[PDB]
Amino acid sequence: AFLLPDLIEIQRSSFRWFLEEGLIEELNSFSPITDYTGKLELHFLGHNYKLKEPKYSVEEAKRRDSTYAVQMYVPTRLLNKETGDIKEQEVFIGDLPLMTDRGTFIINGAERVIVNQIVRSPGVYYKSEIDKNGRRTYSASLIPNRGAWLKFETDRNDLVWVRIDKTRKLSAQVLLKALGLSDNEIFDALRHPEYFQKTIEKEGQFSEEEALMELYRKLRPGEPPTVLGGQQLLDSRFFDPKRYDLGRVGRYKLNKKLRLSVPDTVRVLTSGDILAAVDYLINLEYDIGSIDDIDHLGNRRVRSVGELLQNQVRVGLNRLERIIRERMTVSDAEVLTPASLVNPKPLVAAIKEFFGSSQLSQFMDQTNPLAELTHKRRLSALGPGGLTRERAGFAVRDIHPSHYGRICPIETPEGPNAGLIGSLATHARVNQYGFLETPFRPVENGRVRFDQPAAYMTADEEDDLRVAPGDIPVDENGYIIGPQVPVRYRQEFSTTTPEQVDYVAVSPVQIVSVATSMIPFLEHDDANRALMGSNMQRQAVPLLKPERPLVGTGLEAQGARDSGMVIVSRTDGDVVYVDATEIRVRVSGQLPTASGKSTDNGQLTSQKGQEIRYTVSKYQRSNQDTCLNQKPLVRIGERVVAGQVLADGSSTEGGELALGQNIVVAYMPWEGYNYEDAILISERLVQDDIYTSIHIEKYEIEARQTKLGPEEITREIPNVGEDALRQLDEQGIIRIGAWVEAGDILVGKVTPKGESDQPPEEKLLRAIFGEKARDVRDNSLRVPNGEKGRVVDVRLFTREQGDELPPGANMVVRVYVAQKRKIQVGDKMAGRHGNKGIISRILPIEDMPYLPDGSPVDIVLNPLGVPSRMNVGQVFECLLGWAGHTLGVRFKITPFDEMYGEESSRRIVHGKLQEARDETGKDWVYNPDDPGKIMVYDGRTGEAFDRPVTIGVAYMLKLVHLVDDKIHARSTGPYSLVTQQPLGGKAQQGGQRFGEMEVWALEAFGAAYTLQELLTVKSDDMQGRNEALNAIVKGKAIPRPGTPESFKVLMRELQSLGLDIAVHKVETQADGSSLDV
């Protein structure tokens, strides 16, 4: 049907935008500077970022671990108001990471993306409210884009105050700021200036005192005020465009809100506005008009790099400016070149930073294509400008019914962040103001003509109208059918009739988002469960060859396609040379590359063998250590058109998404294993290499001038022999491609250890061996434990090797090690319907109940389903699958199989089965009696049972966080600094923390020594620790503990704070009072 516009452009667009202009306009707005005395102009033709060009392949920049960027010149102009003379130059000022294929950026060689967030929009708003009785004040409030605010209200007088921040101010003269005659807001309001008139105290004191003491006796107190004062005060605060952006929006709303008339770019405000407000406030004291609800998606706005950036740049400037302001100005009239008077830096920071950190330069994560998408078109509420988790609570997390269509409600982390992080509906997108125009369909006489290329309007939910939910039994040829078609309307649903209706949704699955509108039979499940679903889907590792599932929602080919994890017919051509690393159908020069000569790009390699030499890349690490690669996939000599797709990303398959596989499942209660939240598995499962994935691995290490010296990298190290000085290069590195194991050496380096501190007993033991011992710690690098796996690579980094290292390091070495992994007991692994499950036993294949045809089934989940999960949806499709599994044919589908009085999905599926018999007559393919139930024997001995069990194929999926990702142990190890208690943090020998509630399970029990000791000897009596340890090594018990540390610490503090702690004993018959350490 429709056309899915590109679904990430969201941020393609933005950037381009900016780029295309989004900063010129700022820029040259900031172009005009000039001496401190108007006498020496410093303006520039800010209308060209004249940017020379990126230096690196992307690839490079990865390899160089550098920030793909650009850099960027501004021609400037003829300077000075003393003798008007140019000393013209241009300048670049900074490097700009000019985006990437995935519409994101990479920097420092890593890979990141900038989320886009969502905030309220400048303009004005009113909130009224009650007392404890019903005194129903109002308020008002203003927000620039940037700059302070202006607050108003009505405090049981009906008489009012121009508060500025929260309640900073409060003046009866709410509208007597910079206006004489008074009538301008006494009669020009033609309403109720202070309910018709005047405050009580409508005193009109504002002659020479105008803009004086108002901004002093109850502002900003404590100075001999000065009518200037007050003035130069306000006018700052609202007039230097310097600091008050309304925001195009700003206007744009206003006016709209108040059909003010001020178009005018009037990027900052007026008076007439102000009052205009105030009226409105009044008018509704009298109640003529509406308070405003910010929750309404419409009056709330989302913004992306384009400006996030941009403005952040602006501040870059200002800072810069100053520097210049003087450095340019104050000094003499010659030296001042349009060159050494400007410096990047501050910009280069600001951005270098912005990216380099915000909360928005998030890392990408490329687990798998759709984890991207959905992480680009994610949008967020938090962030600087936003909220915090705390400072915003709840009803600000809910489905304001305007989200409809615009924010998949199904979609959310949790943790606290529920609600704070939504993603984007499928079809949504945004208007240059940064509200989400929502595609729809114009139904005439309550009937969509379809022809309409949708209806890209309804940026806000208040189209206000008959709007139909894109799930309508629709008469062929337009007409709706039921005279009871619902509709939202003014945020309400409402029984409607087909005639008097306007708007239909383009589809019944738009409000949802990625991983949500994809559920095979969504329509049929709990929501939340489907929540989980989605997410799981994002976490499915990718596999050697993730197969396109069987029953899928149609909607995906695209999704893949726009990952940009695949490789797409750029243009056009009929393949020729395609080895497994590129498709020289490209730089070769024949029909591929040459209808890559049909029509022949602007600058690009317009005909020849073109750098349509796409490479294609094997096994690169991911933000999750997962590997990716795109085998040629296409044949040779054949015919492709742009947008087609050439080779496949990690886990996509026919050029379409493919997240996991599909295997035959049964539902029964296998004793113990599977008993509950447990899954069985045949052995063939991973025996066929299905479900095994890759993972690979960064390992770097580096050497560094101790002020003892260097420390190095030798082949040689003391104390070696096999797994040491064996699988080791001349610099003690490894050869590419070397098995390794769990303790062997990655790279060996030593250290200038020397001595200068030793126990006589060590000197002894020399003497006896009189070994003149060596002197060099030897921090080789060893594979830790529980790793395997070939080595892919190394990446040395020293003066010559890029020298990318901390100040004073010599070599840095990366090393990369990969790893197949089969499945194995212990792996979250779940379906597309919140089917969180863990492997428990694997059965050798010849024990599972197989099938009537003996085909051994192979998972076996628990039958009783759709409980709290309410995900009955998944049987539906199992079944289905199985149909297209026996029929051996994939089938797309869509949630909400409506236009059918009955379940529809229900008589499909049967139908298919049904007929599936007879195309093979296998018969047991389908049993109307006990639908899709089957007999089953069971391998172990050879019988079915009283109750036939359903059977289906089904698409499962295996999940990143893998057992090894969470395993730990610690006999003992490194402690803390200050507080010596073992160093528990996850990577490295950590330790289980026993918080109060945990101790509340110990002292709550009976004999609690343990408690005690646990509190100490395995965490603190320092000496206690040791010598226990010992004491067991001895072979006996352990000695009595002492007092833990952290006590002693507490002493200290407290003592360090005006105390006289006398912990102390009271001994002797003379009872003796002492004190202690």
């Binding site: 101790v999 002292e1003 004999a1007 609690a1008 020594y1009 408690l1011 005690q1012 509190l1015 100490t1016 009596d1021 503990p1041 002492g1042 007092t1043 833990p1044 006590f1047 407290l1054 005006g1058 105390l1059």
Partner: protein, 256 residues
């Protein structure tokens, strides 16, 4: 149009929560005396209004208001707060002093007591009921334990005798014990109205300052205690832990 506090889901913890701290936000025009007369509805009233209550063995009329969210109706054979007269949670405190208004004849103890429990009991149930609201089971035996813990502190008054300032909310024994002393060695009788200390007031700033400190007021109680030297032998548990040595039980209960 007035409308309901109906729905499908009601009270839950926070209900608990509250009465556990025994917060005092429960409107309750319960009088401090039993009566027994007619009290048509509002009291006397019924015509447009008069929310109001008994003086049966008495003559005074009395008459306190009430809202349109809580409406009362308990006529005749009325309550010595054998019910909170005016019928919305009387607040164990109001009920306690009411069970003290009615309970002030016996031994000031037994007035206290019979009240005192009276309420307690009360309290307990209350709680159950929430549990049964969910059916969730919690041995009343426990609850007991707490709530007793919750209320065994008097608040002194005219404490010129027991020294405890007239108003020095203190424990039940010591003061009453000191009362006995003066009671047999000359002196007044510091009032002992049995009061509840809620949840948080209970614990925290109490005997051992360490505890407290750790629980809360790490720096708040700290000041003070500091002003008092208030020694803290950490005798008991929660310290032994803080501190390492073991527990009032264990060998401390064996060797002991």
């Amino acid at each position: 149009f007035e409308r309901a506090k109906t729905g499908d889901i009601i009270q839950g913890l926070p209900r608990i929560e509250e009465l556990l701290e025994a917060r005092k936000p429960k409107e309750a025009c319960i009088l401090a005396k039993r009566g027994g007369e007619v009290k048509v509805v509002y009291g006397d009233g019924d015509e447009a209004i008069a929310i109001k209550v008994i003086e049966s063995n008495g003559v005074v009329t009395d008459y306190p208001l009430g809202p349109g969210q809580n409406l009362a109706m308990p006529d005749g054979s009325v309550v010595p707060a054998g019910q909170p007269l005016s019928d919305g949670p009387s607040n164990p405190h109001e009920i306690l002093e009411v069970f003290f208004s009615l309970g002030s004849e016996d031994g000031v103890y037994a007035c206290a007591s019979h009240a005192l429990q009276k309420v307690q009991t009360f309290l307990v149930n209350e709680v159950q009921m929430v549990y049964q609201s969910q059916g969730i089971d919690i041995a009343d035996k426990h609850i007991e334990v707490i709530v007793r813990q919750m209320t065994n502190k008097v608040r002194i008054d005219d404490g010129g005798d027991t020294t405890m300032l007239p108003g020095e909310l203190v424990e039940l024994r010591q003061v009453e014990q000191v009362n006995e002393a003066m009671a047999i060695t000359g002196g007044a009788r510091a009032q002992y109205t049995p009061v509840l200390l809620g949840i948080t007031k209970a614990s925290l700033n109490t005997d051992s300052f360490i505890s407290a400190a750790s629980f809360q007021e790490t720096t708040r109680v700290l000041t003070e205690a500091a002003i008092e030297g208030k020694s803290d032998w950490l005798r008991g548990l929660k310290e032994n832990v803080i501190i390492g040595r073991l527990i009032p039980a264990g060998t401390g209960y064996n060797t002991y």
